[PDB]
Design a protein around this ligand. Structure first.
Ligand SMILES: Nc1ncnc2c1ncn2[C@H]1C[C@H](O)[C@@H](COP(=O)(O)OP(=O)(O)OP(=O)(O)O)O1
Ligand SMILES: Nc1ncnc2c1ncn2[C@H]1C[C@H](O)[C@@H](COP(=O)(O)OP(=O)(O)OP(=O)(O)O)O1
Ligand SMILES: Nc1ncnc2c1ncn2[C@H]1C[C@H](O)[C@@H](COP(=O)(O)OP(=O)(O)OP(=O)(O)O)O1
Ligand SMILES: Nc1ncnc2c1ncn2[C@H]1C[C@H](O)[C@@H](COP(=O)(O)OP(=O)(O)OP(=O)(O)O)O1
Ligand SMILES: [Mg+2]
Ligand SMILES: [Mg+2]
Ligand SMILES: [Mg+2]
Ligand SMILES: [Mg+2]
Ligand SMILES: [Mg+2]
Ligand SMILES: [Mg+2]
Ligand SMILES: [Mg+2]
Ligand SMILES: [Mg+2]
Lengths: 283, 282, 289, 290
C-alpha cells in the first residue's frame, strides 16, 4: 500500500509574527490552508494513507481541519513531534505507520505545480530499490541544497548551499523511499533527511526526478514567498479556471469519492467560489 | 479614559476552508495577523485600554499572540462571545470593562488607511454627546449599509443595502460612542445598526467622512484578503513605511521607548519586520 | 495549399485613452512583448507562416518597423491598411489576393490565448475541410459577450450578441478558421444594422449551412480581450506570473520559430543579440543550449 | 519678469526594454492608465512650472506632439526640440539655451516617477533657493547600484559617486534637478567626461565644488521608480493602479493638477473628459469637478 508522511510542525520563525499563534501549515495560500498543497501532492501520487506529524499545540487544529480524511477517501493519522529538529526522525516516529511498505515524505511548506507531476511520481513509486528525490531547476543553486546527477538519473553529489554549485538543481521537499529507509533512520546518528539521502546515493540507489520548465515550486516560509504563492494560485485559478491542490476535486477525479459526497462537502463552502466550483465540477 | 472593543470572533464562513481551523482575525494580511490592523487603528486614536471579544476556541490564540499588550504600553483584556450573532451584545459583555467611560468599537476584519485618519478620530473622541460612525465613499452603495447625512455631519437615514441608495457612503466597522450606549444595549439579535439608528433618532449621531485619500477593506472573502495583502505589501515596499505596525505606533506615540522596541525586534530579526523596527529606532 | 492567417491590428482603442492616443493598442506591452506578439504566436502555433497584418494608416509602418517581413522568424509577413473604421469582415475583401485559393484564419490583434492543448485544437480546425471553426471560451457572464450555443457534434446552433437570456456559457473569441468560401461570402455580404460587414454575419451564414464547428476552450485555457486599462494590467501580470513561476515564455515568437524549426540555433543567437540587456535575450540563449 | 521653467528628457533608446521599445518610445509606454511622460510632466506642474521644453528623438518627437499638443489645454506652454546626440544629457542646457533665457530651470528625466504628499513643499524650497542647485535624493537599501550623494546636515552635497563600491551614503540621486541660470553657462563651458559626452553628474559636481549644491531628501513616505526595465515597468503600473483603486485618487493626472492649481476651469475639464468618457479616467475628471 502507498504511504506518505507530511512534516507539518516547526516554528515558522521567519514568519513571525503571523506564526506566533498559527501554525505555518495552517496559513492560507489564497483560499486553502497551506497543508492542502502537500496533501494534494500525495493524493496525486495515489497515496491515500498519510501520517501527519505536527507540534503538540497545533496537531489538534490539523485534526479539527482534516478529521481522519475519510471524507476524501483517505486515512489520515497523526503524531506529535518530540524534537524541535531532526527531520529524519519522521521514519522513527512512523515506524509502525510505515510497517513493511514503501513511504513518501513531503514537507508541509512545499507547493508543487505541474501538469506532468503525477507521471513523475508514478515513476518514483514504481522504482523498487532505493529512493527518488525531487529536483528543481533554479537560477541560484548556491542558495539551496544542490544535487549533481547522472544521465541515468542517479545522484552523484549532495551539497548544502555550495559555494561552487555542482549543478543548477535544488533538492525539493518531496522524497520517495523504499522500506529500507526506516532501517537507515533507526541506525543513523540531529538526524537529517540529507544524511539519509547521501546514504542511498552512496549505494547508487538514489534517483533524481527532474522538474524543468513547466513546473512551479515554492518553499512558503517567508512573508514574501507566502504572498507570491497566494498570488500565483489566485492567478492560475482565475485565468485558467481550474483549482490547484483542491483535495475534494482530486478525490473526486481519482474516484476516492462520488458526486454525492462532493455535493455534501460543497455545502459548507457554498458561500464562496470554492463551494460553487465543486458544484460545477460535478455536473 | 479612552476605551475600545475589538470584535474578533465569528465563523468566517466565506473564507472556508482557510477559516476552518484558523480564526479569520489571525489570518495574515501580508506580514501581520489581521487583528494588528483594527488594533493599530484604536492605538492611533490614543486608545490604550482594549477589550478583545472572540470565540471560545480562538480566544486563547489571541492571548498567545498579544498577551496583555503591556509590551506595547497597552492593557488588553479578553472575553468570549456567548452568542453567534448580536454584535451590539458587545456593550453588554463589556459593561464592566466600559464602566463610566466612552467607548469605541471596531470590527476585527476592518482595515483602515489614511494619513488624516487620527485627526478624524480625535474629533469623534472629543464630541461629547452621542456617537460618530465612519463612512466611506463607494461606487456601489447598494452593496453595504448606507448612511445619508446632513451638512452638519448628522445622520438622517440608515439603510441596509438600499435598492434606492440615499447616498454613496457606506458605514464602516468603526464607531465611537458616549457612555449612554451601554444603556441602549441593555434596553434593546441586538444589532449595531439598531443602536446607531437610536442615536440618529435623537440627533446625536455624527458621521466621519472618509473621502479620497482613504482606503478601507472588509477582509472577509478570498479575493479581498489577497487584495488587502497586496495593498499593504505595495505601500510598504514602495513608500518605505509600515501600515498598522503596533510596535512602531507604540514607539512614535511614546507608549514605549527605543529599548523596549529593540527587545521586541529580537524575535523578528529573521525578516524585514524586525529590521524595520531597528532602522526606525535610529 | 498553404496555411494563411490574417491579423486585425488597427482600430482606435478609445477605451484605452489616453495611452492609445499616440500608440496603437496592438503595440502596447503585455509584460515584455508588444501586444501583437500574442495573436502572432497563436497563428505560428497553428503552423501558419504566411500572415497578413491589417492596420491603420499611421501605425502600419510602426508594425513594419517592429516586425519587418517576418523572415527573421521563418515567416512571410505582408501588410495592408484598413480603409474603413469598421466592418471587420472587410478583411477577407482586403486580402482576397493574399488569400488566393487557400483556407484562411483570422485573429483579432487584442486577443491573448493560452493553453497547453491549444495547438491540438487548432490542428483540428485546420484539418476540417468544409466550413469554419469558431473558438469558444467558458465564461461566468455570457451576457457580456457574443454567445454561441452548440451541438454535441460541435456544430453551432445559435449566435447571440450579449443575449439577455444567454443560450450558453460560451463566449465567441477572436480566433476563427475558414475555408476558401469565406472570401466569397464577404464579397457577397451586405452591411448589418450598423452599416458594415460583420464577422458575426459571416459566422452565422456558415452555421445556417451547418458548416460551423465550435472549438471549446475549457478549464486549462486562459483568454483575454486586452482593451481596457484593467484588463491590460491583468494580462501583463498573468504573463509575468506564468513566466516567472514556471520558467517558460508565453507567445515568444523566436522560441516558437525555433521549436517548430522555422529557424535554427544560429538565427536565434543573432536575434538574441539586441535583447541581451534583459532576460528576454538571456532566455533565448539558455533555450538553444 | 522671472518665470518657472523645466525641461523633460524624453528620448533615448530604451534598449533594456526591447522588444517593446523597438517601435514605441519608452516615455510613451503606459504606466497603468497614462503614458509614462504624464508622470515627470505632472511633477513639473506640481512645482508650478508651466513652461516646459520636451526633448526627444527625431522619430518620436511628433508622437509626443500628437499626444500633448502645445499643452495649452492644460494651461501650459509646451515646446519641443530634437536630440542631436545619443548621449550627453547635460547637452539639454545647450539645446535649450534659448528656451531658458535668463530664468532658472528644472530638469527631469522622462522615465522618473515621483510620488509623495509632501513633494511640492520640497520643490517649492528648491525653486526658492537662489544660488546654486538642488538635487533630489532617495533613500535606498542598495546605494551601490545608483549614483550616490553624501551630504551635510545643512543639506549641502559633499561627494558624488557613480555606483560606489564603498557607498558614502544611502541616498541615490534621482532624475529631478533644480538649477539657477548659471547652469547654461556651465554646460556651454563643459567638456566631455571619460565617455565623450557632457554629463549631468559633471554639472552637479561643479555646483558642489562651489558649495552651491543642496540636497532635497525624499525619505519614508516617498516613492520613486526608474521605469526602464520590464520588471520595474510592471511594478510601477501595479503601484499606480493599487494607489488609485484603494485610495480613490489619481497619481500624476495632468488634467486634475491643472484644475486644482487653477490653470484651467471646470468647463475646460469637462471638454477634456469627453474623449475619456469610455473609461474611468474620464469619469473621474467629472466626479472631480462636482
Ligand atoms: N520538529 C518538526 N516536526 C515536524 N515538522 C517540522 C519540524 N520542524 C520543521 N518542520 C516542518 C516545517 C516546514 O514545513 C518543513 C521545513 O521546515 P522550515 O521550512 O525550516 O520551517 P520552520 O518551521 O523550521 O521555519 P523557520 O526556519 O523559520 O523555523 O518542515
Ligand atoms: N459572535 C461574534 N462575536 C465576536 N465577534 C464576531 C461575532 N460574529 C462576527 N464577529 C466579527 C467577525 C468580523 O470581524 C466582524 C463582522 O462579521 P463578518 O464580517 O460577517 O464575519 P463572519 O465571521 O461573520 O463571516 P461569515 O459571513 O460570517 O463569512 O465581527
Ligand atoms: N478598422 C479596423 N481595421 C483593422 N483592425 C481593427 C479595426 N477596428 C478594430 N480593429 C482591431 C482592434 C482589436 O484588436 C480588434 C477588435 O476591436 P476592439 O477590441 O473594439 O478595439 P478598438 O480599437 O475597436 O477599441 P475601442 O472599442 O476602445 O475602440 O480588431
Ligand atoms: N539622447 C537623449 N536625448 C533625450 N533624452 C534622452 C537621451 N538619452 C536618454 N534620454 C532619456 C531617457 C530616460 O528617460 C532618461 C535616462 O535615460 P535611460 O534611463 O538610460 O534610458 P535609455 O533610453 O538610455 O535606456 P537604455 O539604457 O536601456 O538605453 O533620459
Ligand atoms: Mg528551520
Ligand atoms: Mg522552508
Ligand atoms: Mg456574518
Ligand atoms: Mg465582513
Ligand atoms: Mg470597437
Ligand atoms: Mg476588445
Ligand atoms: Mg542609457
Ligand atoms: Mg533608467
Amino acid at each position: 500500500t502507498r504511504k506518505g508522511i507530511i512534516l507539518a510542525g516547526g516554528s515558522g520563525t521567519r514568519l513571525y509574527p503571523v506564526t506566533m499563534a498559527v501554525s505555518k501549515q495552517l496559513l492560507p495560500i489564497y483560499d486553502k490552508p497551506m497543508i492542502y498543497y502537500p496533501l494534494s501532492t500525495l493524493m496525486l501520487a495515489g497515496i491515500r494513507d498519510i501520517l501527519i506529524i505536527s507540534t503538540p499545540q497545533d496537531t489538534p487544529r490539523f485534526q479539527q481541519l482534516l478529521g481522519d480524511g475519510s471524507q476524501w477517501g483517505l486515512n489520515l493519522q497523526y503524531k506529535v513531534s518530540p524534537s524541535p529538529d531532526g527531520l529524519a526522525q519522521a521514519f522513527i516516529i512512523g515506524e509502525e505507520f510505515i510497517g513493511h511498505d514503501d513511504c513518501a515524505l513531503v514537507l508541509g511548506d512545499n507547493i508543487f505545480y505541474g501538469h506532468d507531476l503525477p507521471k513523475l511520481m508514478e515513476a518514483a513509486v514504481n522504482k523498487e530499490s532505493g529512493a527518488t528525490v525531487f529536483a528543481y531547476h533554479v537560477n541560484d543553486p548556491e542558495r539551496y541544497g544542490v544535487v549533481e546527477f547522472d544521465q541515468k538519473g542517479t545522484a552523484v553529489s549532495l551539497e548544502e548551499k555550495p559555494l561552487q554549485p555542482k549543478s543548477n538543481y535544488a533538492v525539493t521537499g518531496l522524497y520517495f523511499y523504499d522500506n529500507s529507509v526506516v532501517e537507515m533512520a533507526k541506525n543513523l546518528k540531529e538526524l537529517e533527511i540529507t544524511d539519509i539521502n547521501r546514504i542511498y546515493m552512496e549505494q547508487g540507489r538514489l534517483s533524481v526526478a527532474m522538474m524543468g520548465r513547466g513546473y512551479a515550486w515554492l518553499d512558503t516560509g517567508t512573508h514574501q514567498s507566502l504572498i507570491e504563492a497566494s498570488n500565483f494560485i489566485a492567478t492560475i485559478e482565475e485565468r485558467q479556471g481550474l483549482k490547484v491542490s483542491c483535495p475534494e476535486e482530486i478525490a473526486f477525479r481519482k474516484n476516492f469519492i462520488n458526486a454525492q459526497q462532493v455535493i455534501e462537502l460543497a455545502g459548507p463552502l457554498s458561500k464562496n467560489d470554492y463551494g460553487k466550483y465543486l458544484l460545477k465540477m460535478v455536473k
